[PDB]
Amino acid sequence: AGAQDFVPHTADLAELAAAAGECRGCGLYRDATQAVFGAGGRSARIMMIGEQPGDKEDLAGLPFVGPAGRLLDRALEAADIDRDALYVTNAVKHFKFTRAAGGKRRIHKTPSRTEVVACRPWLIAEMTSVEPDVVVLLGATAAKALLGNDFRVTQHRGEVLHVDDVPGDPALVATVHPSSLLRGPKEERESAFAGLVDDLRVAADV
Ligand SMILES: O=c1cc[nH]c(=O)[nH]1
Ligand code: SF4
């Protein structure tokens, strides 16, 4: 059942976000500071979904406000997409993490498929509330949430996909997670950034 009994019968994003603050659909709510719901409005035509809030998001209450968010903002700007017009959220709403000794931050840990499926009712409610024309899946966890646990982002870059069990049958575009472009060889990061821009443009051109 997961988060299902915690999701209210409302499409109002403010009411949904407040209810998510109360969610116990999996165990992640316990150590996290708060739930991080999506940001944006129901008029948005483009919904973007990441994996989970990170250290900064857990305390800001907003998605994509750390380094990965800054890289995403650079990609959106290059793609001529206004972040204010998007609805941005994550597959899981509570930060899953650990700390390492000497660490400079809390380290995100990958949600289990079990936690993703537990939290999915929130994603469904968000999609029902926003009725996006296109959904950008940033990274493996988000893409698998809607396209299946076996889905490989690397094999379907910037392809326009459509599956039958998604609300409103929006177009789906799976792409690299912005966090992946933060580190690595310069030429590899630059090529990967260009591909993210391409994928965002495909989505915006739906
Ligand atoms: O909101 C956020 C921030 C970092 N990484 C994610 O997947 N989502
Ligand atoms: S991660 Fe999702 S399902 Fe789990 S407690 Fe948080 S909001 Fe509920």
Numbering used by the authors: 2 to 207
Authors' description from the paper:
However, UdgX is unique in possessing a flexible R-loop (105KRRIH109). Our earlier studies allowed us to propose a reaction mechanism of UdgX, which involves the formation of a covalent bond between H109 of UdgX with the C1′ position of the target deoxyribose sugar concurrently with the uracil excision from this site in DNA.
It possesses α/β/α fold with four central parallel β stranded sheet sandwiched between the α helices. The functionally important elements such as motif A, motif B, and the R-Loop sequences of MsmUdgX, and the conserved sequence 90TNAV93 found in UDGs are shown in Figures 1A and B. UdgX follows a unimolecular substitution (SN1) reaction mechanism, wherein the glycosidic bond between uracil and the deoxyribose sugar in the DNA is replaced by a unique His-deoxyribose sugar covalent bond (1.5 Å) in UdgX–DNA upon excision of uracil. In the next step, E52 (motif A) activates the H109 (R-Loop), converting it into an efficient nucleophile to facilitate its covalent bonding with C1′ (having a positive charge imparted upon it by departure of uracilate anion) of the target deoxyribose sugar. These interactions remain intact in the DNA bound form with bond distances of 2.69 and 2.79 Å, respectively. Our studies suggest a major role of H109 in carrying out the unique role of UdgX in forming a covalent bond appears to be facilitated by its ability in avoiding a water molecule in this location, whose activation by E52 would otherwise result in the release of the AP-DNA, as in other UDGs.
